[PDB]
Each structure stands twice: as C-alpha cells, then as structure tokens.
Amino acid sequence: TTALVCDNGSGLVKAGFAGDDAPRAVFPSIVGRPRHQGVMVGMGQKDSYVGDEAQSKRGILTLKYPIEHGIITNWDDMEKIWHHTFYNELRVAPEEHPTLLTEAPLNPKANREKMTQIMFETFNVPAMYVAIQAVLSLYASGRTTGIVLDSGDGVTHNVPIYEGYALPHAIMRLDLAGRDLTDYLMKILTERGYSFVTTAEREIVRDIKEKLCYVALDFENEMATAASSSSLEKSYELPDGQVITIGNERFRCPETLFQPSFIGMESAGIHETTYNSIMKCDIDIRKDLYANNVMSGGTTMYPGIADRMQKEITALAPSTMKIKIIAPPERKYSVWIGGSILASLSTFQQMWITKQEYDEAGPSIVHRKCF
Amino acid sequence: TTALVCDNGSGLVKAGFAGDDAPRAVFPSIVGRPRHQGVMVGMGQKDSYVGDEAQSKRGILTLKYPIEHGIITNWDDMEKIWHHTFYNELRVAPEEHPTLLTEAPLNPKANREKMTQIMFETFNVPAMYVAIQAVLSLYASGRTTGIVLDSGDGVTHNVPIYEGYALPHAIMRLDLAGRDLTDYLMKILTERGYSFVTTAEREIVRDIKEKLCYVALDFENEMATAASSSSLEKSYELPDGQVITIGNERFRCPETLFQPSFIGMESAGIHETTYNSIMKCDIDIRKDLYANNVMSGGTTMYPGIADRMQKEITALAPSTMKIKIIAPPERKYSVWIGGSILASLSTFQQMWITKQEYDEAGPSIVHRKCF
Amino acid sequence: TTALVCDNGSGLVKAGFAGDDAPRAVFPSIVGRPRHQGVMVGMGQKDSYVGDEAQSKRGILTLKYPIEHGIITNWDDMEKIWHHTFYNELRVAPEEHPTLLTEAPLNPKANREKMTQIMFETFNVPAMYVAIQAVLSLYASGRTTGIVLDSGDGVTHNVPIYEGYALPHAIMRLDLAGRDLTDYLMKILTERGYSFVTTAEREIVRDIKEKLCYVALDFENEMATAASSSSLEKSYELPDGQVITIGNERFRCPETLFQPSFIGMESAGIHETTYNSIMKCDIDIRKDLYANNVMSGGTTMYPGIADRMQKEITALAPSTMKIKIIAPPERKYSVWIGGSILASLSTFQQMWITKQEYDEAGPSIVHRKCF
Amino acid sequence: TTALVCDNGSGLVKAGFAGDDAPRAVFPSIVGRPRHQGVMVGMGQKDSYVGDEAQSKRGILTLKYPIEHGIITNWDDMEKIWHHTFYNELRVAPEEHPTLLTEAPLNPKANREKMTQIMFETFNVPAMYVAIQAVLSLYASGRTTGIVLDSGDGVTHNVPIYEGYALPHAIMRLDLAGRDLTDYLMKILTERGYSFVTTAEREIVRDIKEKLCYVALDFENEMATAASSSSLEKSYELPDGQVITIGNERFRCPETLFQPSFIGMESAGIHETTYNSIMKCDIDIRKDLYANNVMSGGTTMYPGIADRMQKEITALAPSTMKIKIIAPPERKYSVWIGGSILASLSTFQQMWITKQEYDEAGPSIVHRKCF
Amino acid sequence: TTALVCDNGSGLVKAGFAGDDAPRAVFPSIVGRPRHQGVMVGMGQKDSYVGDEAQSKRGILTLKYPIEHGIITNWDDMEKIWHHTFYNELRVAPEEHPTLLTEAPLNPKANREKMTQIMFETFNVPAMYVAIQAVLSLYASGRTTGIVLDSGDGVTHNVPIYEGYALPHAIMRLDLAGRDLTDYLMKILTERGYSFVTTAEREIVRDIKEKLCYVALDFENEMATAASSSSLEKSYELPDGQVITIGNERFRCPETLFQPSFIGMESAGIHETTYNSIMKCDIDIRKDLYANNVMSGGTTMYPGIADRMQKEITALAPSTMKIKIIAPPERKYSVWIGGSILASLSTFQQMWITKQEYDEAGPSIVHRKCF
Ligand SMILES: Nc1ncnc2c1ncn2[C@@H]1O[C@H](COP(=O)(O)OP(=O)(O)O)[C@@H](O)[C@H]1O
Ligand SMILES: Nc1ncnc2c1ncn2[C@@H]1O[C@H](COP(=O)(O)OP(=O)(O)O)[C@@H](O)[C@H]1O
Ligand SMILES: Nc1ncnc2c1ncn2[C@@H]1O[C@H](COP(=O)(O)OP(=O)(O)O)[C@@H](O)[C@H]1O
Ligand SMILES: Nc1ncnc2c1ncn2[C@@H]1O[C@H](COP(=O)(O)OP(=O)(O)O)[C@@H](O)[C@H]1O
Ligand SMILES: Nc1ncnc2c1ncn2[C@@H]1O[C@H](COP(=O)(O)OP(=O)(O)O)[C@@H](O)[C@H]1O
Ligand SMILES: [Mg+2]
Ligand SMILES: [Mg+2]
Ligand SMILES: [Mg+2]
Ligand SMILES: [Mg+2]
Ligand SMILES: [Mg+2]
C-alpha cells in the first residue's frame, strides 16, 4: 500500500519507499558499453554496465547520460536504468506498487506520454502520477507560502507559491546548472597544464568541485588578495599519486552562477531571475515572499552561498523590507523527502491515474491533470 | 580429445599434452648438417641432425637456428623441426589432434598464413589456433588484471590487460633478448684471452651465463668493490679440463638489460618500457597495474632480478603508490602451463578454426580471429 | 622598421621579414647530441647540432623535439633553436627589430611569461607580441568571416570568427595531429616486416607519408577493391637501395583523421568537431559560416581531402544549406603569409608591448592583451 | 514649407514628408551594442548599431528597445534614434522644417517636456506640435464621427469622437499589445521543444506571427477539429534549414486579444473595452457610433479579425441596431497617412508652437495645447 | 721533440721518426738460438741472434716468433727485440723521446699493462700511448669516413668510422692471416713431392708466395683452363740450384681468403665479414661507407685483389648503389705513414700519458684512454 517514490534526477537517481526518512539507493544515471574487444576469454562479461559498475570499470567504458536538460533523448538507454532500479537495487516487483515520478515544468509534452506508456505496458504499474519537482520541495519545510529556487544537475527554475496556489504565468526556466559548471572547470584547470579530455575524466574533475570550491562574498577583494595570499592555495590527489595545486581557481568556478557572462551565457544570474519572478506577482504579496525564500538542490551546497544571496538581493529589493534566505541543512534531499510525505498524505488517493482510465482516454490523459 | 600444446620458442621448443602439468619434451631448435666428408664407410650416417643429436655431434656440424626475432626465415628448416617433434619425441600422429601454436604479437602477417597452410596440408591437422604468448602467461597466476613483461630467447614485449580487455594501442615490442646477451658475453670474455668463435662454442658460453651470472643491486658500488674483493671471483671448467676464472664479468652481463647503451642499443631499458607502457593507459587504471606486475620468461631467472626491478620502478612511479613485483617460481614454464589450462577450458571449443572454413576463405581467414 | 615574423611551429620553424611573400628559412625544430665518443681526433666537432646539420648526421645523433602538443617542455633546448634562428639563418641582430611570435590558444599561462622574459632579457628585443595562430590564417584569404580549421604538426583547433569578433566560448582544442599519424604508420608497415625503431628512422617514415598517401572518398569500396586491384600498389626506395612495396597502407593512414578510434582515440573526428563548433553559435549566423569554411596547415595537403570534407559535412548539416569548402593552394604557408600582412598593417602599432611596460607590470602583463 | 511627419511608434519608426502618400523609411527602433571584443583589427567598427545594421549583425549584439508602453525609459538611447532618422535616412537638416510628433494619450507629463526641450535645443527645430495618435487615424477615412480602436506595438486605446468633439471622460487605455503576444508565443512553441531565449531570437519568432497566424470564428469548434484535421498544420523554415511544424498553435496566439486571461491579464478583452467606452456616452449618440467603428494598427492585420469583431459585439449591443465594422485595407499606415493630410491642412498653421513662445513660458507651455 | 713511431707488427717490425716519410728499418721479429755446440773455438759467438742475423745463420738456429694472433706469448723474447730496435737499428736513446705503440683491438687487457710497465721501468720512456691500428690506417688517405679492412701477418679486423666516430659495437675480429696461408701452402706443394718441414724452410716458402701467386677473377674457369693451358706454369729457384715448377698452385693459395673452408675454417670470407660489418650500422650511413671502402696491409698486395673484391661485394649489396674499392699503392706502409702524421698533429699533445700519472693510478690507467 506504500508508494514507490522514484525520481528522474539529471545526475543522481534517487529511490526509496514512502514513510522512510532517507533514500535507500543513490547512484549515477550512467549507461556504459565496452570500447574494446574481450580477449581474456570467459570473464562472464556483459554487454552493458550501469550504476556502480560503470564508476569502477571507468577506464574501458564509453559513458552516456540519457538525460539532457531534463529532456530524455534516448528511450532505450532510459528504459534500462529503471529496469535496474526496480529489480536489483530495491529488489521489489513494481506491479504491486503505485509509482510516483517527477519532472521539471515546461517540458515537451511528448515526454509525459512516453513515461506513462512505458509504465503502463512494460512494467504494468497499477497507477502513476507526475508531480512537479519544485512543488514537492516546499513540503520539506512544512510551509505553504514561499518562492522556491531549485537548481539540480541539469536545470534551474523558480516557482512562486502563495496560499497553495501556483502562479503559472510567473515560472522561470533557466538552463544553467552543475553540468555547465563542470564543463567550465575543465577549461580553467587547463591554464595550469593539467589535461582532461574524456568522459572518464569528467567524472574526476567533478570530485574536485565537491570538495575545494567555495563562494566569495566580495569577489573583487578576494581575487585581488589571491595574488599574494598563498594561504589560499590547496592541494589534492588524483587516483594515481599525481598531486594537484589549486589557487584562485577555487572560487572562480561557483562565481559563474552569479555572472553567467563568464561562460558567455546571456541569461541573467540566479538572483536576477529570483528577483524578476517576484516582480511578476501582484503588488500585494511581495512582502510575504521575501520572508520565505527557500533553496534546494545540490548546487546550493557550496559553503557560503546563502550569505552571498542575501547581500545580492538586498541591493535589488527596497530597504525596510526584511529578507530571510531559508537555506536549511540536508537540502540535498528535500525534493525526495517531500515526496515521501506527500505520497503518505491521506487525501492524495484521489489523484492516482488508474490503469482503466488510460485505456479509455489514451496517453493524452496525463495532460488533463497538471499545469 | 586433448589438445597438443605445441610452441614456437626462439630457443627451446616445448611440447606436451594438455592436462599434464609439465612439458614432456624440451630441446634446442637447432638443425645441423655435416661440415666434412664421411670416410669411415658404413656409419649409418644421416644428412641432418636435430635436437639432442646436434648437441652431441657438436664438433663436426654447422648449426643454424631457423628463428630470428620470432620471424621464421627458412621454412624448409622449420618444417623438419616439427616433423621431428610429432613423430619421434611425442610419438603421436597429429591428424587426430587439434594443435595450438603461439607467436609474438606484431609479426609480418605472411608468417601466420604459412604456418596455417603447412598445418592444413602437410600434417593435415583437424584444427588450429594461434594464441598470443603474453596472454597465455597470465593464466599461470590465475589473475585477470596485470601488466605482463615477457622476455624470451628472442624478443621482449609488454601487454597490459585490464578486466580481460587487451589495450592494443599500448603494446611495446623490444628486440633485446638472451641471444644478444650471449653475443655480448663473448666480447668481454675475450678481455681475458679466452677465445670463442664458432657456433659450436656459442653453445658453450651459454652454459656460463646460466650458472655464474647475477644482478647487482647497486652496480656502481659493486664494481668499485670488485677491484679489491677477490671473494667475488669464481672458477668453472670447460669440456676439456681447461679452468676459467671470472670476476666482475659475472655481473656486467645482466646489467645490459637495464642499460642497453652498453651494447650500443638506442632503445630504453626493460623497466623504462615497462613504465612507459603504463603511461599509455587511461588515468584511472594505473593504480591497479602497479599491483599486478607479473614477469615471465627465462631471462628473468637470474638471482635478484625482482629486487632490482622494484628499486628501479620506485624511482619512476610516484610515492604513496605501492609496487608489488610478482616474480613467482617456475616462471620458466608459465607460457606453457597457461597453454595447458586454456586448451582445457570448456568455452574455447568455439574458437577452433575448422578445416572446412579454411577451404572457403583461403589462408587470410586467420587474420579475422586475432588482434 | 620591419617586423620579424618568427614562429613556434611544432614541426617546421618558419621565419622571414614582413613585406616579403615567402619565408626565407624553413628547417626542422630538432636538437641533436652525439651518442658516441669522437675517436678521429681533431674533427672540429661540436657539442650539439641543430637544423640541417641534424638531418645529415642522422646516423649518430640522439634527436629531441622540444615542442610537444604546443607546450614547450625544455627551455634550454628551446633557447638554442632561436639562438640559431637569428644569428645564423637570418643573420640579423634582433635588438633592432620588433619580434612577433605565435602560439596555440588554450595553453598553460606560464609559457606565455617564459617566452616574454626570454625575449626581454636574453635577446633584449625592443618589443613583442603574441598572436593566436588561427586568427592569422584568416588574413591569407582576405576574409572577415569564416570558421578556421587549422591542423599543424602538433595540435588541431577550431575558431569561428564573425564580423571580426571571436567567440571564445566556442573554441575546440583537439590533440590529434601529424605526429600521431606518423607513429601509427610505423605499426601498419610492420605488418609487412619492414622494421623501424629509432628517431633516425621516424624521419624516414615521414618521407613516405608526404609522397604516397591519399584520401579515399568511399573507404569501404576502396578497401574492398584493394584486395584485387593490384594497380593500387606502389614502390619506393629507402636511402640504401632497399625497395619497399605499399598497398592498402597508402590510404589507411589518412583515414585516421576521420575515424580516430583506429588509433583508439576517443575524441570525435575532425569533421565532427568542425560541425560541433558551429552548433555553439547563435542560430542566426550558421548560414554564413557554412559559406566560409577555410582550411590551413600541412596535414590538409593530402590529395582529395577537401572532396571528402564536403561529402562528410553534407550528411550532418541540413539540406538546402549550401556548403563551400575553401581549400586554396599554398595553404601550407597561410599562417606565415597572414603574419607578414598583419605586421605591415598601419594600425597594429598600437599593440606593441613596450619594454618599459614590462618593467613596471612584471611578466603578467601579457595576460592583459589576449583572450 | 512642408512638414516633417515623424513618429514615435513603439515598434517601427515611420517618417516621410507631408504631401507624399507613403512613408519613405520604416525600420525597427533598436539600439544595439557589441557583446564581445573585436579581434580582427581594423574592421572600421562602431560603438553602436541602429536600424537595419542591427537586424543584420543580429548574432553579436545586445538589443534594446528604448520605448516601453509608450513611455520612453532612456533618453540617451532615444536621442540617437532620431539623430539617425534625420541625418542618414531622410538626409534632411531639421532646422528648416516644422516637426510633428505623436504620442499616446494618458502619458506622464514629464515626457512631453523632454521631447519639447530636445527638439528646441539639440536639433533647434523652428516649431513643434504633439498630436494624439488616435485622432490622426480618423482622417484616413475622411470621417468626422466614429469610435477608433487603435492597437500598436505597445499600447491599445479607445477614443470616441462625435462631431469633431472628443469626449475626454470616455478614453480607455489598455496595456495589451503585440509585444505581449510575441512573449506569449515563445511559451507555447516550447511545448514542441523548439527553444528560443535571446533578444536575437525574439526577432525570429515575430516573423512567424506575421505569416502563419489567423483568427478563428468559433475557437471551440476549431480547436476540437484541430485534434484530427491534420490539414491545419503548416511548415516554415528558420534561417538555418531547420524546419518547424505548427498546428493549433497557429490560432491560440491571436485568441489572446479576445481572452486576456490566457496570459493571466485581468483587464477585459478588446471588444469589451470597445463596447464599454460607448457606454460612457450620452444615450443619444450611441446609434451613430455603431455605424463608424474604425480600426487601425498592425495588430489588426490578422486575416479574419473584422469578422470576429462583428460577431462578438453583436452579442453585447441590442438587436435592431446595425453594426458596421469598417476595417479598410492599408490600415497599417493610417496613423501616418492622416498625419500627412493634417500637416497640409491650411488652418493648422495657427497651432505651431513657436520657438519664441517656449523661451517665455518654459517647457510647461505644451500642457496648454492638448487634452 | 719528435715522436718515435714504433710498432708491434706480427711479421715485420717497423720503426722510424715522425716527420719522415718512410720507415728507416724493417726486419723480421725473430729471436733465434743455436741448436748445436760451438766447436771451432773463439768465433766471438753470441747466445742469441735477432733480425738480419737470423735470416743469414738460418741453417743452425731454432727460430721463434714471440707474437701470435697479436697476443705476446713470451715477454723475455719480446723485450729483447725492442732492446735491439732502439740501441742498434735506430741508435737512439729512448729516454728522451715519447714512444707511440700500436695493437689490434679486442685484446686481453693484461697485455696493455705489461707493455706500459716495461716502457715506464725498463726503458724509462718519458711518455707513452697505445693507438688502434685500423684508425691510423685511415689518415693515410686523408679521409674522415670509411670502412677499413686491415689484414696483417697475424689478424684481420674491420672498423667502420663515420664522421670521426668509431662504432665499437660493429667491430669484427677475424683470425685468418698470412701466417695461415703460408702453413697451407706447405701442404699443396707436398703434392708435387717437394718437402719442407723446418722453421728454416717456412722462411723459404714465404718467398714463393710474395712472387708467383695471384688472384683469379673466375676461379672455376681458371682451374678448368689450368688443366690444359701449360702457359700458366712458372719456374723458380731455391737457394741451391734446385728448380721448382708451379702450376694451378699459383692461385689456389690466395683463393683461401675468399673460401676459408678450404683450410677448414668455419668463419666467413673476408668479403662476407666486410659486408656484415656494414649491416650493423644504422640504415642511414650505409650509402656513405660503400663509397670509402679502404684496404691496407700486406696481404692485400696480391695482383688483382681489388678487382675480385668489387665483383664479390656487388653480388651482396643491392644494385643502384655504386661501390668504389679504394686500394691505393704503397698500402704496405699506410699503418706506419698514418702514424707519422698523427704524431705530428698539434692537438695530440693532450693525450700523452705522463710518467707522473702512472705512479698515482697504477698500470690500470691505460684502460681509461681507449675503447
Ligand atoms: N558536496 C557537494 N558540494 C557541492 N556540490 C555538490 C556536492 N555534492 C554534489 N554536488 C553537485 O550536485 C549535483 C547533483 O545535484 P542534484 O540535486 O542531485 O541533481 P539531481 O537531483 O537532478 O540529480 C552534482 O552534479 C554535483 O555537481
Ligand atoms: N638457469 C638459467 N639462468 C638464467 N638464464 C637462463 C637459465 N636457463 C635458461 N636461461 C636462458 O633462457 C633462455 C630461453 O628462454 P625461453 O623462455 O626458453 O625462450 P623461448 O621460450 O622463446 O625458447 C636461454 O636463451 C637462456 O639464455
Ligand atoms: N607534401 C605533404 N603532404 C602531406 N603532408 C605533409 C606534406 N609536407 C608536410 N606534411 C606534413 O606537414 C606537417 C607539418 O605541418 P605544419 O603546418 O608545418 O606544422 P607547423 O607549422 O606547426 O610546423 C609535417 O609533420 C608533415 O606530416
Ligand atoms: N503581416 C502582419 N500580420 C500581423 N501582424 C503584423 C504584420 N506585420 C506587422 N505586424 C505587427 O505589427 C506590429 C507593429 O504595429 P505598429 O502599428 O507598427 O506599431 P507602431 O506603429 O507603434 O510601431 C508588430 O509588432 C507586429 O507584431
Ligand atoms: N710482395 C708481396 N706480395 C704478397 N704478400 C706479401 C708481399 N710482401 C709481403 N707480403 C706478406 O705481408 C705479410 C706481412 O704483412 P704486414 O702488413 O707487414 O703485417 P705486420 O705489419 O703486422 O707485420 C707477410 O707475412 C707476407 O705474407
Ligand atoms: Mg535534482
Ligand atoms: Mg619463450
Ligand atoms: Mg603549423
Ligand atoms: Mg503604431
Ligand atoms: Mg701489420
């Protein structure tokens, strides 16, 4: 009777039963296939490797991500990832359990049909739903009013919610995300002669960004000091014993989120879209949203991001308005934790799209029960 | 139903049925022909002598090796050696039994056709295969990951294998081998006035190198000590009672493998090619290869070679990486023992090149089933 | 008052005054040192040989290239090459003349300081600049809009230029070049038993590739025909009278640029990076770049490369878009000819980095006047 | 002696001498500035581009419109546009000629002073006037009684005129216009996965709306049919050969003008404000206005708009009253053509605001000679 | 200040001051001692006879050569020969003059110490050197590149020199020489019944070989003709009037150098070692050595040897390579003439091994200053 809260994270798939408080599995969404012929006969080899397998065989595999900007580009890759998720990681047969998926808002409608038909006719789920990720993030705080800024592996979006009403004219989609910051980090490391090229090495640079990067409060003073304050510089080890030394490159990376023109992006910075979504609201409610500005998603984990956000938005919003950036701990899981709560809420049983209803309407039925 | 594991060693032919644990015959690959006319009539003489015959008649024969650098230079000599191997040493008719041969990698393709056509139309074998020697060496340890350094009578090569995948872009062929060390030992012995010239005497110098030579750990301190430490010097007897005295010449011979410029060779030493083959690998797997660095071939039998290898490669590879030179005993037979195992492995029955398949494709078929 | 257009080619150094139309000197960038002791006393020997000297003494020298992938690895070798270039080949004192250098984009910044400090304090140049090679190539056609594909001895890169604006977010660096094709040609020649090993012999294989190789338009039909059409095969002489015969090896070499997986490279082929650099551009300008697709660098000299390029990119770009591969003659010098023009253009006198400006800023000044 | 009929269109500036019958120049009101540094030296570049220049360089420019909702937001941008208009497009010196401007009614009075002072002291015009756009539209029909519905790029308004008297208590200003319809078209195209983001791409979507959109007479039956009648769907080409397919999106765009709640606008539809302006009139004259309901402005060019207007207003106005929507051809220029006539009418010479009169009154004088 | 160019010829000692152009003394290296008791009292007899004395008393002496294969076997005999050379033939005291000796390469090192200690402590020379004979031969032609084939009384060797660098990995030592040809001539003369046995008679057969032997160009046709062409046969007188008649024995002697299997030698003929030394060289330089193939030593004086050499090596070396056997006149002295030049060359004064340096290092010092 418990729901399977699944997910379609662009980076990490997340899964675990409702009523639990932490996800049971987290693993990268990678499909990999061998690049060279097997020559030691009888390995018990496989045609393809997924999850942890592909982070270990990482020297001999072509790696693909089947998700780009939240749009699934290859359904035969994407179908294998789920076929692994149910049968091997959770080890639970899906035809007993209602399955709750998620996606970003403002997606090409054809994706919502494909996921529905795969669930109803490969896996034969009893029922399905398709929630909108930012809405689930808000239940983690137990609030009912706030602007959500959510920034995953592959997209950033804003959704203002007031009194449990969404304002669908105000949503912003901003295609700037951790995958872009990683691809930019490869170019500034090349200034020091370290060279990375392959998909096997992208997965090594990403381990730097999770450990040594932090956000400066006054980037101009910081970068002027970094010319002399050698105490900034830090050292890290590759898999082989090759040492790496890192300097002002520690913070020129996450500075991209506040000045996307560094990666040549035309779209405004994350605070300028956070502000400009409030300006779409009726001139009453603005006072309430400045008190409930909630952040989620892993690309807000960098130490000091909340302190920067407050100082930036204080320059835009008028004075006498107080601003309260609510950036709680564990915000790397809120989108999943909120999923666990909602799937347990007694009233939601009205919304399960039945198998019988799809056979009469055809796939388009899921356009009737969303924004 | 058992396979004949044959071989094409440059020095010693090795043969014996699969499922046995030691080769039944080992003898030098020499064809010899008389240099002078028979004058005591009625000896029951022969036109040519092969194997043990030629190591005994060694005063009256012209000796030839039909193998140079793993490339067979004379097919009519080479065909006699096998004609001896089956009918007289194993005393088994070959037209019952699948025959497994070996060769070094990176060979002129014409050799692989000649061996195939001789097997199919002189001996009329039922089936054939052509394995790559270094790959077979790895089964002797029962490993599935490692760098193999194999150095026979006539060639040295490296092959890194990861997860049962070979990396054909990384293979090194190095034409420095025991035959060169023997031809160099003849020149430094001449410093003491002992004189050897003929092919009958090359086979006597080789008996020195197998008995009195050893590898110094600190060649500069060793050679500086050898000027005074008379306890280094050793004595040995020729076939006649002529005594020989040997001194710093005990170790200046195997020092050649680490400094080929002594024989004027331009190519780097065996550890520098062992290292530089790892540097062709993707920056993930290096950590695994430093733990599985396996040696085989008779020119690694010298006492103390493994201890030298470790100290040399520790200077090249970064610290904090542990290095484990796995130089097991009996490594003079691993290439054959691994052959016995592989020919018994149940899955290999898919690979036997049938007689029927050669008559349709022609000799080129064997280019389709190798690197 | 005329500029010295120097260069840092990975293969051939090129030099000659501005306002001339062809370079006065071209010679390989090799430093060589003797491998054996001089024994005929009184030769008038030298410690080291550079340029033409080392292509003649080619049997007794260790040869090094001081340039790898456009990154200078040894400054004491590299300083000798220039010390030869000014004083012996041009026979002109450099302290009169402004000196214009070049380098590939996306290089470790430390190299740009070293070259600057050597010019200001060994040679005492009056002024210096550091242009970006692909930008100079475009002046040879007198165009102001186009995508440049430039592929020298040691690196390949793409730079789209529109209306005289570079788009620094779109540049591709691809480390696949003639030096890799030569090292691959040594392995497929070994199939026929010809053996080359030493740096003296690499400089002989390279003479084959410049003379007998050509690009097939339909590699699958060509290779299927080459099994029977003996009229493909060609013969060539080594320095000694040893004849060589070459067959399908004529074209399997330059096929590498379109399928780098043959040398096991993961990066896409030169047309796939040429295409994928256009896809970084704003959806307006693509129509203009398909009309101005200019090639330069010696590794585009092979007969028939332009005809292959057009047929390949026509499969990627949509129809109704016309494609015009502009592959003019003399494209082996465009990067130098464009240098001669730019150094004569009246407005460039604003950009000469003065000696006085370096003494105040220190070496970092050259980071202020580039991409 | 002829007047310069200039204009302040929100989208297209329009200019041409009085007594001509068609405007001599029409070009977008855009100022653009380069986004990246010039790197091909000596282009003859400019700091800023205006008019046709900016529709061609459209891949490298930041574009701004200096007009929003008829309120000029930046006077230094706006002053350049006119500086281009006189000296380069008309190529006529303005200090000879009386200049007639226009603006929407109900504007912040400060704008009317700024335009006046710029004309008197930068350009030194001999005289000026400031007509109200909807009043000029009526002379194109040669009528003297009618309700005008005028809907330009940036504002919509209604003005009833009876017997040449305006009724200033009845004017409606409605801030819904083509710029809003374009920004809404970007969101429904994203349903099909086509993505546009930048100001360079807004100017491409606008080319769709001028070509494929039309107004349905019975939107509910049309949209119900569009689920099956594939003959609705149409195809169009981007600048690159990318084909686009469009379906019910052809007509859901201009449906916004009749149901602004689709874009979440609270204000009533254009017919409901057209009706509710008549209800402000004295209960005599209504019969006359239903016979002279004249439309102008480009956002009434869509095929079939007049037929929809008649059926809508027939539901509001009582029966037995006949309704006659007068939607003539060329209504894209009436506001300019009527300007040409009025500036030639002999009696208007009483109204030219003299230079002498401004120096005595100060800028406020223009509040004395309007509504 | 002039050097004493001495020598250690196996057959003829050669001596004469530097700066002279011909040796002042040449005499056989023989020590002889009486075989019978003196019985005519008061002859003024001597215990031993050396040089010309022993060629005259040749009927009553035991003769010994103290040199065998270039290795001195008896130092008390060898010390007398020099004691004669200085005090009686040159009549010059050696303690004034630097003394230059020679030896063959590849000799037992103990010989180089013995000669050094005898020179420093019996004769008390001021300085010494030990040159390598084949290197001195090359100065006679004034060349700096060539392969030297040198074949004295007691050894044959090859040394390729390129650009004044020797290639110590390529040297061949071949122990086939005039002393062997003389001992073979004694056996074929015995076919005609002439009998020689004693050391007194060996010195008579040697006078035949210097006068009647010549090399056939086509030995098979020559020997077939010699069965009938009596005009071949020649006659010669012994010391007594005994006439000797010689026929095909004129040329079957020097034919041994091209087919050593006639004397049962296993080693290849002098042209096969001359060729096979070139094949040790890097594949560049071979073209240069075929143009500078210089011969020296008395066993190349036979009429027609050069014409045979060219026809033989033309069969081995590929065509299109030209071959130029440089066999100049006076080649019986080149090894001495080149000694006279080198000892006069101004730079050689750096190499004289001082007396002071030997007393510190001990005898081993001379291993430091040679190959
Ligand atoms: N400790 C960390 N510090 C900073 N960033 C992190 C850290 N751990 C993970 N990340 C970033 O989190 C991203 C994944 O965000 P996530 O919210 O999981 O996206 P999704 O849920 O859509 O997979 C990774 O791409 C990585 O860049
Ligand atoms: N006891 C020993 N110590 C050192 N070297 C040995 C010993 N026995 C044999 N060898 C060397 O082993 C070489 C043969 O190596 P091997 O692996 O048999 O080559 P292959 O297998 O190709 O014939 C011989 O040439 C000899 O130099
Ligand atoms: N005739 C030719 N045909 C094909 N390739 C050539 C020819 N001549 C030279 N090359 C190639 O040109 C390369 C040098 O390219 P180049 O543009 O000179 O590089 P760089 O300018 O950086 O030295 C050489 O490595 C060689 O492989
Ligand atoms: N052929 C067409 N069909 C429909 N709309 C059009 C067409 N041509 C132009 N438009 C619209 O006309 C608008 C401009 O209206 P216009 O009356 O020129 O405003 P202004 O005069 O204030 O610039 C443009 O924004 C565009 O949306
Ligand atoms: N006229 C000649 N023709 C052929 N051979 C000669 C002649 N004169 C001398 N010889 C040979 O020259 C040999 C001596 O060679 P030589 O170069 O003097 O040796 P070395 O210099 O070491 O004494 C003698 O043994 C003799 O056989
Ligand atoms: Mg996420
Ligand atoms: Mg072996
Ligand atoms: Mg170049
Ligand atoms: Mg208008
Ligand atoms: Mg001699």
Residue numbers in the entry:
A (entry chain B), B (entry chain D), C (entry chain C), D (entry chain A), E (entry chain E): 5 to 375
How is this structure described in the published paper?
Tc toxins deliver toxic enzymes into host cells by a unique injection mechanism. Here, we show that TccC3 HVR modifies only actin filaments (F-actin) and not monomeric actin (G-actin) as previously proposed. We present the structures of the TccC3 HVR enzyme in the apo-state, in complex with F-actin, as well as the structure of ADP-ribosylated F-actin, thereby providing three structural snapshots of TcHVR activity.
We obtained a 3D reconstruction of the ADP-ribosylated actin filament at an average resolution of 3.5 Å, which allowed us to build an atomic model for F-actin including the ADP-ribose. The density corresponding to the ADP-ribose appears only at a lower threshold and is not as well defined as the rest of the map, indicating that the ADP-ribose moiety is flexible and that probably not all actin subunits are modified. Therefore, it is unlikely that the ADP-ribose modification itself is sufficient to stabilize actin-actin interactions to an extent that would lead to a toxic effect. However, when we compared our model of ADP-ribosylated F-actin with available structures of F-actin in complex with actin-binding proteins, we found that the ADP-ribose moiety occupies the same position on F-actin as the major actin-depolymerizing factor cofilin. Steric hindrance of the cofilin-F-actin interaction by the ADP-ribose could provide an alternative explanation for the increase in bulk amount of actin filaments in toxin-injected cells. Strikingly, we observed no binding of cofilin and no severing of ADP-ribosylated actin filaments under conditions where wild-type filaments were rapidly bound and severed. In conclusion, ADP-ribosylated F-actin is impaired in interacting with actin-severing and destabilizing proteins, resulting in an inhibition of actin turnover and the accumulation of excess actin filaments.
